[PDB]
Amino acid sequence: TGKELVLVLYDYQEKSPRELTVKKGDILTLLNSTNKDWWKIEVNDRQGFVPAAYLKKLD
């Protein structure tokens, strides 16, 4: 794991600094996929986290 890809199925709203906003339909680089709840992605320079249920990965 390191630079995979995940599809932001929904519109996520930034709630805490750790997380970042994503526009549903965006396929982003799945960095840290550890933590069932809250994955770390890199939506436009500067990574952050976003819940799992929101991100569709490829196993």
Tell me the β-bridge partners of 19.
49
CATH homologous superfamily for 1-59?
A: SH3 Domains (2.30.30.40)
* Domains in the chain: boundaries: 1-59
CA dihedral 25, 35, 3, 46 (to 10 degrees): 70
Write the burial class of residue 24 (CB in 10 Å: 0-12 exposed, 13-18 middle, 19+ buried): exposed
Give the technique used to solve this structure: X-ray
The gap between the terminal CA atoms of the chain, to the nearest Å, is 11
